[PDB]
Design a binder for these strands. Structure first.
Lengths: 83, 54, 87, 87, 83, 55
DNA sequence: ATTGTACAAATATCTGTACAAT
DNA sequence: TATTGTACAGATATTTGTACAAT
């Protein structure tokens, strides 16, 4: 997480956009009035939100945790599917 | 999701920064060389990270 | 054309549900499975995403706006952790 | 600097819960209530939206990425249906 | 819901974008292989998504419906709040 | 959410219609004159309309 | 009814750079 | 220090109606 301030971000916005895409890193931009932001690539945002979608509901999170545990402990069902 | 191109985001960066904080909203900044970014409030980022890393 | 798929117990029940009450979901899930088998975990239809946190090692594709196919691939063998959102 | 506010039972439980466990939430909620009283149901901070379906007549503003303040204005009196997402 | 075919939508895209924004209408665009789309204004989309967000979870939908009925019948709690 | 400008969207309309159906996501196409639209699959629109009703 | 592809001139974006004033 | 609104200006990209060709 590279930290920068607003004035640097404003003056170097294209460089920050190119960095978070090429190096898949994130920038926190600081404000003096405590209105800070985080900047990330669209690819990282999409990836983050998709996991967030699955985890945000506690029951779906537990459903996923239990199902992955079942698969890793060999408690499974085989299906043959014509495709 | 607010959508603005790079030139607008630079000309109005501060407004966008207080916008995503006031609205708990996000901005996607487009670019002509396929280097888009997303801007969110730091407190929203910390909240989401906490949620997905239990 | 005929694939061998591992399901978690809970994903198996949900697939069975769809087989009874929602043939369109089953058709979509099967098209996603075909894409996974043909192109691998990260390529093809459904907007493949690589999952994070304790879901690391697994991937998700969109069945529709609401439901996700959460899966992994073990040496070309597909395992389904989920195919339906749980509330 | 002071507002008369009507809560639903469940919304008041969740407001008090936020008072005891999350002061940051109560501050943002009160900031939203101030903006509703000053600017009306649809203008101001929090991405105000007009709700549909059986929620027609009510509005929502974002407390944060996850939680919504669901409210209506009845004769300039703010009524709160919800201030915390229920899973 | 206006219904148009793919070729018309291609040849008249800007007019469709103008219409769904000015008239707050939507258009369904058909294709011969059945993968149709509907087009709406970005503001209509945000409005629908926010209601969908609150309705998507059955327990939150029930919570909201009960809270609104409570406010309707007057089973409420009224407090002064300093803001 | 895919984001494209109006000219790209028209240039590639059929590909975008296919993609939002195959991937069950959406396209915001941008305009210079504040007339942005969102394109989603019809099946997704119908699904979302159904869950909007309190059952 | 379909898709990819084309023309072309008005408008918009792009991007470093930097001046005041704080 | 770090802040914001503001501006220049050539170069490059977007805009939009129209429409050919082949399906």
């Amino acid at each position: 997480m590279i930290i920068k301030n607003y004035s640097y971000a404003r003056q170097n916005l294209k460089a920050l956009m190119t960095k978070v895409n090429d190096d898949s890193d994130m920038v926190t931009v600081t404000s003096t009035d405590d209105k800070n932001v985080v900047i990330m690539s669209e690819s990282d945002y999409n990836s983050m939100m998709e996991t967030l979608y699955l985890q945000q509901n506690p029951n779906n999170a537990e459903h996923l945790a239990q199902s992955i545990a079942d698969l890793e402990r060999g408690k499974t069902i085989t299906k043959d599917i014509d495709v | 999701m607010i959508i603005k191109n790079y030139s607008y985001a630079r000309q109005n960066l501060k407004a966008l920064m207080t916008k995503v904080n006031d609205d708990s909203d996000m901005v996607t900044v487009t670019s002509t060389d396929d280097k888009n970014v997303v801007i969110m409030s730091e407190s929203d980022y910390n909240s989401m990270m906490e949620t997905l890393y239990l | 054309a005929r694939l061998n798929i591992t399901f978690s117990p809970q994903a198996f029940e949900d697939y069975k549900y769809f087989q009874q009450n929602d043939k369109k979901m089953v058709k979509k899930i099967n098209e996603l499975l075909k894409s996974i088998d043909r192109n691998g975990a990260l390529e093809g239809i459904g907007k493949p995403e690589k999952l994070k946190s304790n879901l690391t090692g697994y991937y998700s594709r969109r069945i529709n706006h609401e439901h996700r196919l959460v899966y992994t691939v073990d040496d070309n063998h597909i395992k389904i952790a989920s195919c339906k959102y749980h509330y």
